Amino acid sequence: GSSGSSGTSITPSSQDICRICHCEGDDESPLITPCHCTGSLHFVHQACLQQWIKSSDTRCCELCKYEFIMETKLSGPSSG
Ligand SMILES: [Zn+2]
Numbered sequence: 564g565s566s567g568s569s570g571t572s573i574t575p576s577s578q579d580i581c582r583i584c585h586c587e588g589d590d591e592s593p594l595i596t597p598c599h600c601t602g603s604l605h606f607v608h609q610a611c612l613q614q615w616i617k618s619s620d621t622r623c624c625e626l627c628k629y630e631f632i633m634e635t636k637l638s639g640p641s642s643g
């Protein structure tokens with residue numbers, strides 16, 4: 564049987580953990596609220612949040628359209 568088991572499922576609201584990587588909150592990458600939105604798995608890792616912002620190409624929320632919190636120090640690269 565060169566086939567494994569897997570289907571469509573979603574982790575219940577038993578424990579609050581990252582929604583992007585789905586891992587335990589670390590001291591440096593603790594589950595923090597990027598916006599007002601609360602309840603659901605809206606708790607992403609301070610770092611992870613970035614990776615998502617890059618891919619999704621979005622800085623603020625999708626609904627509340629609130630700017631996420633990303634430790635910024637230097638302007639760095641930008642669109643231009
Ligand atoms: Zn994460």
Ligand SMILES: [Zn+2]
Pocket residue numbers: 598599600624625626627628629
């Ligand atoms: Zn939001």
